[model samples]
Target: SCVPGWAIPHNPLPSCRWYVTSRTCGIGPRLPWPELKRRCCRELADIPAYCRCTALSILMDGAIPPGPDAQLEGRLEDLPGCPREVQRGFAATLVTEAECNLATISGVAECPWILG
Candidate 1:
């Protein structure tokens, strides 16, 4: 079977709540996919937006992409749920892949905020 290395179930993260904040999640044809999911498990908290990239490192899936969010956003009544750890991983991956700034990238990689 030449199936893709991963299947839907293989997705590391679960569904979550989200909102539209980016061009991808806008209310237009360009909306990336289905509005942004609010992460039934919110990703960031009181941290500043600038630090969000770093905070995402806590995610375990390491930036998988949008799907569970879409599912949740699509079904307003149903919440898209995923393992907390997996969603964290995906967020981490997204942070790593994000091209915020090379210096910031290196800085975040070295920051050990998860040991607590």
Candidate 2:
């Protein structure tokens, strides 16, 4: 099973989405999305730099411990990790909305799968 892991509350990331296209025509009208990507639903076999599959959302990884949100307090000199907020925001922005959304889905799915 797949699930979310530690999230730097306000941390940034690289990519989020993984589009699936057909290998046939390469430029046909396009195919309908599979209800449950069987290979995807297999509960295993996710091999990639990052697993953005919804099933990953249904896995049993672990909990996402709350991390400090990114912020830019004047006292950034005082606090070390606060700036993480800004960095995260920018990084998130770089990703397409679709990709950004997956992290949320993945994060949400992690815990319950563990208990299951």
Candidate with best lDDT:
1
Write candidate 2's Cα lDDT for 1-106 as tens digits. 2223422211111111111112111221233334223322222223221443322322212134335853321110111333423322322221133322223234
Tens digits of per-residue lDDT for model 1, 1-116: 10112222222223321321122122223333333333312333223434443333322323333464532211112113433443233333332324122122234532334322
Clashes of each: 25, 4
Cα lDDT for residue 67, candidate 1: 60
- The C-alpha stretches of model 1 lying farther than 4 A from their native spots are 1-31, 34-54, 57-81, 98-116
lDDT of each: 0.29, 0.25
Q: What TM-score do all the candidates reach, one by one? A: 0.27, 0.20
Which candidate's TM-score is highest?
A: 1
Residue pairs clashing, model 2: 2-59, 12-88, 60-114, 70-85
- Model 2 spans with C-alpha error above 4 angstroms: 1-82, 97-116
Candidate 1, 75: how far from true, in Å?
A: 22
